[PDB]
Design a protein around this ligand. Structure first.
Ligand SMILES: [Cl-]
Ligand SMILES: [Cl-]
Lengths: 507, 509, 508, 508
């Protein structure tokens, strides 16, 4: 076990042990199956987590809804103060926590640290928002009536997250849901159970130091069984789900079946489009980093690169010369730009996708092979010569394969951006003012993130994050995404002694 | 003979109605589907007929609406607002005859029929201003040389399914908002209010054609479960607004979720009024009366459950019984008439069924419970005491004028009892206690989407969002930022600088 | 003889005007002050007369307005919005004759006169929806059992002083918003547009009287500096909205500040258009012509300064020169006419003086510079090249159709030159450069209240807030949250709990 | 001997203070003006000295701040928020010694000195989130191919003048908001709290310096009326936020108005509490006591007028007297002290004068009214009954702990009496009546900026905008959209279409 090797002793700074309890609700436990998580950079086991049994889930839900009775009564600004302290406790652990993200998930250290910083940043944002959430006081049309839009917590927010952002997506949901007066129940990705435990330990200490019931931020580590329970559980007032479209579809249906609320953040099949007037010294690095970043395992990863015919072959050749320089190595080591895939299965998926892409006329112009070293390393791959509607370019595989397409006119390539089932992120690179505003308008991108001269991964906590179509429609983080965590009521207070009716109806 | 052919009802022609009307409008009028005849519930006489849409009619209409959308979405929202303004004027010019048609085909009294058309006129006048306001913030990017912009664009085609009990206003709320938001609309109204749907569409069609706009911007495809199911399963319907039963809304919500579409669900209510010991009873009794017997108990927001504190229970019931006796019954178009018939013969049959089962469950009918002996679908507005709050008959979704009265003692329990039902539409308390009022409005208070104090559960204005939680389906219509459900948000980052990203050790050119 | 007594102008009666009109309305019509005669600037003939407010008229009008406010403030905002809707319809119905009156008394062409009424109609319809929206947030209190609410209430009496050049729309902007916000209004329009103020007031008064509301809700006291000074010094005028010259607006602003009142100041502009080298010149030339010559150069947003990049300076002046020669001049009601007369004889004399001074400072008149030899106050629309951007004549506030053309090289200096004038109303750049556009909109860009790209300095729409910075005075009208200037904010904490305060060792 | 030179006050050096301190900071520390000595009101002993700003110091500081602004305005608002976050943390780490300095130099009890620093901390943390939120709407243009955008940009240099009674929090409110809004600041604190201003400025200076930012982003120029007047007249001060007396604030408003600047004025309050028949007396009596005697009655929001209904008047006054006798007077740094000295010797004689004047005008001193026989500026907290609501001393603006108590009969007259004073800062009613509470909050209710229910006149939190109406000056600080006063609005139209304007007969 890596945690039992002196090189990884720093894992104990996060309170991690050989075997860890994967259930927290004020108390720590775990009566379900023990899971070992592996370091994808060497395929070695790191440590073990005792996951939630059904009995653990039940006890946790009950204790979190008991906790909600206390927490919902705490003024939102004082809830913000708790979230501020969570930000600070995360700030104090950012290097080791980020290193664990690199160790258990596989992304490079700057992105592991960056993910914790994002949670830090959303906490600091939530502090201010906790003094702002609410609705309008509106002028009633009736004398002696007040008309008020109130917002109240939904109660228990269940949060299912994925392996590729094992800290930040939970942090987005947690910070906003907390200041909105909800309790949280977290089921993280099984293959990032240690990250889930570490984060939960950080939060639990803040809650306990403030003499708040720990179940405000409950954890039930588990897989599809616990997640299915959450989706089915009328006690989970909002289920925020981040993951695959196939799973998210079933989750959305189960929540809809019980008239629950769901917040779905699912796949992206994101395109970058480089027009003829584009700054190629901006296009080439923007595409490389958006395609190879996180080894192509981001929901926002650039999977499709449309290049205008006039510059297609130049951009491809400059991409090859730049791909050749990507520094591959251990994700925690300095100046490493490219790490492993998360699992051995994703390497098998990479190989399958590469063989099928060639079987559809594509030319692997760079990469396409597994790397001959320990861990789940594959070459960042560029495939040209496919048609935009090719089956392989509409399949959903978290693989570092960049499909490059030619295009000729603005209307057709906008349609090509919009033609896929998902709708997360999109980018155009152009200088044409009219084109930019058309891209942003009703006949433009159909995505939740619509970028210009910045790649598909450019997104900051200030705006709402999420997509349309098969991406599932949810939003996280900024703008008024907080309303998804609360219940709107339209309230009328008659403080007079008559009964005027709306629309002047005389009854 | 049909009512429209009787001289008594020559005014139906002023709405463009004929003996047989086309129930499909997409810029042209038609319909190859089943012919339906609607009946006047005040006298069970047939009014006129409508040729409904076939699946092929609906297929053709979707195609023409989405063609129309290419034109409409290019029209600036304020100029779309001007078209909506003209619809509100065109409704104003016909408010009396349209109100009369609502009273005739649906059965609510005239002032409520006109009042429902006024709701549509009001949201039109409201949407005019909103058309110059919809949109999002420009935000400060954390990146130098970047702009961060929240854009809002139309979803495209908004399918609108409505019910019989509000055959004008609910479509009007959806239509005026969806229109200024740059969407085209496709309306499948309630089969038993087909003439109202045709009459409304004829008013809108003239405004669109007078403005040389494609008529499919406000398409109409009359039909029933076949057309509604097609809309729920049609990926081309970007947003499906459904008002109606929880049972059907459940399946519609599932069908839309299965195809990753958008739905806006406005389903039932099982709405409570709670009268605390300090309540002004001169507000309680007229409010409970209107909330329960308005529209013959057929509103989504009708008061079904009357919770009265033990101390004032008998007094309130006695006053309510007396007030019920003073209810003026007649033809819903007649003057001073405050109580009309139920919408259908079936509603009468189910009403008698509910009354009997409530008796079998231990209730006492303290007023009503019988059919009225007169033409049409008239039943006595009915009050039942003595049931437990958990009585099965009081947790049935029946559209009947039966008010279930319960006693209670303390505030915490009756708040929980308000909340214990599946639905969560509207709720009201009568009290003077400041602390009680803010508790009711707070996180431990009513779980409903409409949370009222010292007024009935029904009769919302357009300024706020309208809708419920839980099995009411979660959608919102009309006011506040309800318009966002009709549009798609995009978070847009524009790099306007000459700045290049960090080379990260890579040698570019 | 009065134009109103001639048969060609009988339509004036449709607006309820007669030979001598009452310039005070407070529910009753009157006017014990001096009688003013307004003149058609197209022919210098007298139109009709208006009896202005005496100071006793004004005092009685303030009293009646504040009495009317007690009723009006109690009317729910959305029902006040319905009154404003009806005002929009009443204007809609008289739009042609009221537009024609604006052209007759003020001098602008009919299409703009009608369009000014339509602007009032448009803000009325905007205000109808806004009447269901004005208010503030309910906010989460940091204290358990406390509600925190931001309330907005009418300030009370809104005094409105308007200028001759937009004698309908500016009042309309202030009226519609002030009215849905629960204020009563007192209007003192420009003396030279007194008939228009009376005609507008008659239309609104009919709406109020038909709804059985006190007419003093929209009071009128026609008068000049005497009544305007009284308003500026009157503690009972809770908000004074002033549209006018910077010189007068400065003194109004100080008078209101002296009494701790609220003012809203919409003062002059010295508005620049900047044409960069990459600009679409077929967009620049018509935009510049219509922004400089529209309303005979008498808008607050008129283009006064045309900075052209040195590379295209000569082409644009030449293209502009050929375009000016095609401007159709005539009576402002004649349909083909683009260019009307200036508003007064005095404006002609001052235009000629601005031209001569511009030549003395090194300018070359490349087009115009002269009076036209027809009746009325017509001058040629004028282009002056050769002056430096700091030329004194270029920084004089004169309401004359004189367009000063400057050269420039780079973006930093020309942004600085846009910003160097005392006023800060409107500004426009023409360019295709993405970064330059967003720099123009950013903190190192235009310092004006209106910041336009590829469109001229005039023609704003009701959806946004209208107004300027610096010596333009800071006020905002019309859209966005400009309504907040017409209301008072209160931050309201409601303790609804039974909690006692901490005793701090004291036995209570 | 200076207190700072006495061993028991060695903790003052934890704030970087010494015998004589530089009162000018602009990236460099300096001060060529007059040396001022500040005194501890608990014992009238000198604490330490500050070298104030000369005019040359002011000039150099304005120049350096305007240079710094060119850098600071280019830093993204959220990165400016991160600087303000670190200011919050830096204040956290000094909260105890800084709170103690507030208690020493200004005289308020220690929990309020600490609490004032905590208020700056809290607004910093709030502004961090606000820094990712400030901006305006993108609006739907009525014209095809046009974007319509409401932009907000920093005004530039925000001058901030503050008073003795909140020598940290008021600057904090202005500083944190102005900073995230992209402005640089120039602070002139009250001369008698010069050491507090220096201490705060040292804390901020280290944050700016550690982040390699020019210190003049948060400049300090210690001084009195001469420096404040310079700021009021200086066109380079784009916004002048002033907190102080109405008399000075009026002149500051006039001076800024004279140059077409922006001011934000937070002036006196003459704040009333109203207790109706149905009020919870267990809540009224402590609420009135703490609101009246808090900070020895030297708050802007201090309860000066207490209206009690005739039925409960004598009972409330009796209970107030029993509780007033329990107020623990002492050194403001000593534990469990509720009540400290007045800020100055001058304030004591003012207190004396008002007490005899209330007597002469017909009032009865039921409690207090005398100077206390101890070191420092201690006077007794005073209750005065029997005056009419219009009694002239109750409309005098004194920072004295004198609570004037009045009888009332009905709701209408007492609402009018709350409103009759010249200021309009804070107001409170105690009642259970639901209709009355909404009338109080409505257009016929309180005319103040703060309108409270069952919580006294000092009920304010950073989430809401803070300020008042009428002679209180109109400014707002802290919450809601108060940030907009620190920025300039522009309404921006971008034409991104290839569409040409109508030629209107002209051949371009
Ligand atoms: Cl390159
Ligand atoms: Cl007491």
């Amino acid at each position: 076990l890596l945690i039992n090797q002196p090189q990884y002793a720093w894992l104990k700074e996060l309170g991690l042990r050989e075997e860890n309890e994967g259930v927290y609700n004020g108390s720590w436990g775990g009566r379900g199956e023990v899971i070992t998580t592996y370091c994808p950079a060497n395929n070695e086991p790191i440590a073990r987590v005792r996951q939630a049994s059904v009995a653990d889930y039940e006890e946790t839900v009950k204790k979190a809804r008991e906790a909600w009775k206390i927490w919902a009564d705490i003024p939102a600004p004082k809830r913000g103060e708790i979230v501020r302290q969570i930000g600070d406790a995360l700030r104090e652990k950012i290097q080791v926590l980020g290193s664990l993200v690199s160790l258990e998930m596989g992304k490079i250290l700057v992105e592991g640290v960056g993910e914790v910083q994002e949670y830090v940043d959303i906490c600091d944002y939530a502090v201010g928002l906790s003094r702002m959430i609410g609705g309008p006081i509106l002028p009633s049309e009736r004398s002696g009536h007040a008309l008020i839009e109130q917002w109240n917590p939904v109660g228990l927010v269940g949060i299912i997250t994925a392996f590729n952002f094992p800290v930040a997506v939970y942090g987005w949901n947690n910070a906003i849901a907390m200041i909105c007066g909800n309790v949280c129940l977290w089921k993280g990705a099984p293959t990032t159970s240690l990250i889930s435990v570490a984060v939960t330990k950080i939060i639990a200490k803040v809650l306990e130091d403030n003499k708040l019931p720990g179940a405000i931020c409950s954890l039930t580590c588990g897989g599809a069984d616990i997640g299915t329970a959450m989706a089915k559980d009328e006690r989970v007032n909002l289920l925020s789900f981040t993951g695959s479209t196939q799973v998210g579809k079933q989750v959305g249906l189960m929540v809809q079946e019980r008239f629950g609320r769901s917040l779905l953040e699912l796949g992206g099949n994101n395109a970058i489009i480089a027009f003829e007037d584009a700054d190629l010294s901006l296009v080439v690095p923007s595409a490389l980093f958006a395609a190879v970043g996180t080894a192509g395992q981001r929901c926002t990863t650039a999977r499709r690169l449309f290049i205008h015919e006039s510059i297609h072959d130049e951009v491809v050749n400059r991409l090859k010369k730049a791909y050749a320089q990507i520094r591959v190595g251990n994700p925690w080591d300095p100046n490493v730009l490219y790490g492993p895939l998360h699992t051995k299965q994703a390497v098998s998926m990479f190989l399958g996708a590469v063989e099928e892409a060639k079987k559809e006329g594509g030319t692997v112009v760079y990469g396409g092979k597994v790397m001959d070293r320990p861990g789940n390393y594959v070459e960042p791959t560029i495939v040209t010569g496919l048609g935009h509607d090719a089956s392989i370019a509409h399949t959903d595989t978290f693989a570092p394969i960049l499909y490059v397409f030619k295009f000729k006119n603005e209307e057709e390539v906008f349609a090509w951006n919009n033609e896929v089932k998902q709708g997360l992120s999109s980018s155009i690179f152009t200088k044409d003012l009219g084109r930019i505003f058309r891209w942003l308008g009703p006949k433009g991108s159909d995505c939740g993130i619509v970028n210009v001269n910045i790649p598909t991964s450019g997104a900051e906590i200030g705006g709402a994050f999420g997509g349309e179509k098969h991406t599932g429609g949810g939003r996280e983080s900024g703008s008024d995404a907080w309303k998804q965590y609360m219940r709107r009521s339209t309230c009328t207070i008659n403080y007079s002694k008559d009964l005027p009716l709306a629309q002047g109806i005389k009854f």
